[PDB]
Design a protein around this ligand. Structure first.
Ligand code: FE
Length: 186
């Protein structure tokens, strides 16, 4: 029975119940993520920025079923065009705004990747993506406001592909955590 998360800690407890089985009810996970009202005091520990690019900060390992992490986006910071390695990916805004641009999977032929759509994700909104939906790029286009987002990936993954927008060619990238459980991990 899906109740409103009172705090980040309560949210994490609810997610462990939702991921207790072998499958994922996407709409229920999205609904509970959206229902958590961002409270900056609860996640300040994980919000560790870098001057030059966005940072990934591990919050919870989900008893092995999912990774929950906080991403911190300085002004102008963005991602590659990327896939999600056959995982579910949920993205909830905790602070600021992010622009999400969707792309189709490239064809074998080298060609410019054209965007299919774009939207602005605003505070407390939760977006969802998986490989069957397509690829995306996520960017903080603000010149004045850092953004902070809460990401849930199931199953967890530590590698994905980055796509060259000019050709559609991909390269495997291994992502690293900036911090884990509030502790910087160089
Ligand atoms: Fe993504």
């Amino acid at each position: 029975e899906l109740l409103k998360p009172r705090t980040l800690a309560d949210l994490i407890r609810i997610l462990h119940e939702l991921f207790a089985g072998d499958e994922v009810n996407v709409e229920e996970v999205q609904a509970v993520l959206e229902a958590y009202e961002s409270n900056p005091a609860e996640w300040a520990l994980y919000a560790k920025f870098d001057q030059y690019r966005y940072t990934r900060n591990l919050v919870d390992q989900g008893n092995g079923k999912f990774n929950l992490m906080i991403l911190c986006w300085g002004e102008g910071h963005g991602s590659s065009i990327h896939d999600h390695t056959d995982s579910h990916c949920f993205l909830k805004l905790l602070q600021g705004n992010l622009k999400e641009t969707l792309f189709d999977w490239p064809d074998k032929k080298s060609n410019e990747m054209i965007k299919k759509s774009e939207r602005t994700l605003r505070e407390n909104q939760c977006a969802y993506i998986n490989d069957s939906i397509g690829l995306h790029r996520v960017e903080n286009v603000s010149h004045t406001e850092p953004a902070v987002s809460l990401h849930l990936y199931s199953p967890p993954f530590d590698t994905c592909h980055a796509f060259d927008q000019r050709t559609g060619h991909k390269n495997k990238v291994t992502m690293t955590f900036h911090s884990k459980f509030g502790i910087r991990t160089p």
